[PDB]
Every structure is written in C-alpha cells, then in structure tokens.
Design goal:
homodimer; about 160 residues; mainly alpha; Serine Threonine Protein Phosphatase 5, Tetratricopeptide repeat; biosynthetic protein; DARPin; dimeric; DARPin C_R3
Amino acid sequence: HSDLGKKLLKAARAGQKDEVRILMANGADVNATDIWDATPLHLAALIGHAEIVAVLLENGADVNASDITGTTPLHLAATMGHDEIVLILLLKGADVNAYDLNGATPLHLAARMGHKRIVLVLILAGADVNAQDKFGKTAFDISIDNGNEDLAKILQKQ
Amino acid sequence: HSDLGKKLLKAARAGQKDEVRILMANGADVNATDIWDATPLHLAALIGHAEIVAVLLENGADVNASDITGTTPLHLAATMGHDEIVLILLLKGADVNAYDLNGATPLHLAARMGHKRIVLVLILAGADVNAQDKFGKTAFDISIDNGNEDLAKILQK
C-alpha cells in the first residue's frame, strides 16, 4: 500500500506515462504523499508532464493538495510556465486563489516569473487580482516592478 | 535502509532531536532523500530546528544538498528568517551563492522577505551582491521594488 504509492511518486517524477497508467490500474494511491507533502500531481505539475497530470486527475487526484510550504500543483505549474497544465488543473477544479505560506497565489507567482499568458488564463479563471501577498503586493504591482506595463493594464480589469 | 532513512526524514521533520541521534547511531543515511530530493537537513532548516541542523551536520550531512527545485537548506533558512540556522549552515560550509531553478540566491530570498540581519550575515559570509536572478534582478533591485530604503543602502555600492 505504501509500496504502490512510492512507485507512483517515482513514476510521476520521472514522467513515465505508461507506468502511471498501470500503477493506477493496479490500485495505487493517487494521493500518496512524501515527507515534503508532495503528491504525484505536484511532481507532474512541476516537471511539466501534461498527460500524467490529466491521468492523475481522472483517477481522483486531489487537485488542491498543498505541500509543506502550502504550495499546490497550480502554484507549481504557474511558476514553471506550464501553460497546458495550468489550464487542465483549472478545468478540473483547482482553486485559483490558493495561497502558499507567503500569501502568494498562483497569479502572484506567474506575474513574478513574467508568464504573461498564464497570468491572463488565471484572470479568466477568476483569480482575485486584488489579492495581496503577506507584504502587500498585487500581481499588478509585481508586473510594474518587472517592467510588464502592458500586462499590468490588463490586470486592472477595466 | 529505506526504512531507517524514512524514519530519519520523519524525525527531522517532527523536530525529534533524540530520535534523530539514535537513528543516526544505528546507521541511518544522513543524506536520505524523499521524492522532492528533500534531505533531513532541508526539513530541519525549513522548520527551524537548530539543534537537529547541528546534529545532522556533525554526522556528515551534505550542507549543499539541493532539492528538485535547486533549493538548498540555506535558501530555506534565509527565506524563513531562521537567523541561527543561517549562521550554522554557513559555518559548516554552505555555499552562500547557491542558486535555485530561478537563479535566486539566499541573498535574493532574504532581501525579498525583508530579513535585514540575514542580509547582513550573508554579505559578511561572501554573498555576491551583484548576482542576478533569471530575470536580471539583484538583491538591491528587489529592495528598491519593495521600497526598503534601509536594505537598499546596505546593498548600494
């Protein structure tokens, strides 16, 4: 039981799509968690394996699982710039306004990394553009700081 | 070995100092890693358990271990504001200029979080104040963006 979950974590990290499918067919715990509170979905969202993300979600993966830093799969995909994964997660119910241990939402992180299309997707999905991180910054502020004035204008939602 | 390493990871995360000591005496791998490539030292640095950090380092923990995001224990301690742990890690050989997957060094992270004393410590320890992250930002730039006049002057040339 522990064993199949560990195998699934390893397969998700390694991007082994067919192994993920067989492990799921054999009853592996889709929400197996390691010491960092990382789940298979976190690993797949970090590395960018879109088919694995979709397979895990189809099999009941917790789309809003938070690791020990409060980081969700959506945070990871938004930070890494994985556009397709951001969209899949959102369509399968990811909480667009989840916040990590710093009060950062996925919108803050995408703005910080300058991922303009992801920022726009998150707005479209209902991200609270007025949300402030623990220090008072909005995605608008971050975009100004990063010289992305055009994106800041869109973030105003006017 | 997987068992003992997993037990050590769990004891480090939980802050169980005597259990950490006993597990290591019984041969647990001080550099055991989970799926995130987190080691016991990462967990102890994140949570802020200074004695466990010290015990792990006494037993040969890799002070520069990097997780799957390129994050070292010093990055975690610097972000969390764990002054004592930052100091212990540096004294035991942590690379003050290690960078994560975003090119962030510990100095960038401490500057972003406004941890003035940690910024000063990192400078004293040889932090490269001219280090740029993946987006061209130095710690000085971050302090300006945050309106942190005190930190900006500390970092100004």
